Design a protein around this ligand. Sequence first.
Ligand SMILES: Nc1ccn([C@H]2CC[C@@H](COP(=O)(O)OP(=O)(O)OP(=O)(O)O)O2)c(=O)n1
Ligand SMILES: Nc1ccn([C@H]2CC[C@@H](COP(=O)(O)OP(=O)(O)OP(=O)(O)O)O2)c(=O)n1
Ligand SMILES: [Mg+2]
Ligand SMILES: [Mg+2]
Ligand code: NA
Length: 357
Amino acid sequence: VKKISQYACQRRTTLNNYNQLFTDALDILAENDELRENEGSCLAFMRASSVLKSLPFPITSMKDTEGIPCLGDKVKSIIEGIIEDGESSEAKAVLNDERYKSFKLFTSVFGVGLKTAEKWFRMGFRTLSKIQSDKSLRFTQMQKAGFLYYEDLVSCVNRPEAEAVSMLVKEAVVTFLPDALVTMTGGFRRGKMTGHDVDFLITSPEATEDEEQQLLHKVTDFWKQQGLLLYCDILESTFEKFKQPSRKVDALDHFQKCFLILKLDHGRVHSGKGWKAIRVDLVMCPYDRRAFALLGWTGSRQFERDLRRYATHERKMMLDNHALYDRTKRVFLEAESEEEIFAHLGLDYIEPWERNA
DNA sequence: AAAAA
DNA sequence: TTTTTGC
DNA sequence: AAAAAC
Ligand SMILES: Nc1ccn([C@H]2CC[C@@H](COP(=O)(O)OP(=O)(O)OP(=O)(O)O)O2)c(=O)n1
Ligand SMILES: Nc1ccn([C@H]2CC[C@@H](COP(=O)(O)OP(=O)(O)OP(=O)(O)O)O2)c(=O)n1
Ligand SMILES: [Mg+2]
Ligand SMILES: [Mg+2]
Ligand code: NA
């Protein structure tokens, strides 16, 4: 009776996936299209996987797919094949493809993305040992850290580790800004038990322009003094309070942020070398943009993209990590909470643990 | 690859 | 049919 | 440079 929306921001997606046999296959097919730079086919498989993740029951026949959006003929053929013998011949062919295998392996290194992975593949590299020992290749500072702490970074961060990191971040931050509000964002805020990193949003209601700018520098210098800072890259803010919206933009938000690798001592974890390398991201935003930043950094990636797609196509609004603009009313819409952003968009509030699209 | 214009 | 798909 | 980092 209730029609499933094509938008992830109009669906409740918890971590209880009843269709993992279908979505694991669709995620592999999407990933292969991402590698082949086939953006359209990639996004169609990501949308199909996302909608099946929201279902409160497992698909057991083709009749069960009736009325479900984002499931076209190609996707229904994949579902039919999995119903047939419990396997996807299409996803199995991708898992055995040499280009696909190399891309997964090379991009598993921190500092290596799609372009460097494609370059190494076309050069004839197939293993990380052959890449690392090559005398002609030159590695970025990020890739050097990626190879040095590879085993720790490839093993994902669990909840006791994320909590131990949260304690470290909070206690370092409130030492320099006692009124600062520190929120863990990303997957762990959505209820995940694991993650590739631990993300935090930091904001302060009373800090000055200089205090706000200096906090990430003070906190990382403090960790450097303790020999806990394994990698650090601080990106200064390019945030402009009244910036013009534009629907053609690239990647990262304009807030001050830092991409870190921290040394997490085993003694700090309440669950070898005695420590684990952990990827940590810290974002500092101005107090009045805290709701937009929290919403953008909570994710999931599919939830964020459908929020923006819904704002554009259904409400003639422009949304990003800093603001919400109404093109008809010609006004920016302010918000003190995520709930107020959802209400401006005319969406029922979706809890963070329901944003696992 | 799917759905809207 | 052509356009859009977060950004 | 691009590419990487979300
Ligand atoms: N293409 C992307 C990548 C990230 N994000 C946002 C939403 C999630 C947040 C953090 O990025 P990740 O750390 O990659 O997300 P994750 O949800 O925390 O997943 P993981 O569990 O792997 O750390 O940034 C986004 O909107 N779009
Ligand atoms: N137009 C250009 C300029 C440079 N490069 C490539 C080849 C060398 C590589 C060097 O990056 P640098 O920033 O010059 O390297 P680095 O200074 O030696 O040190 P780091 O480890 O911090 O990256 O970039 C390129 O492809 N096209
Ligand atoms: Mg994360
Ligand atoms: Mg992150
Ligand atoms: Na990578």
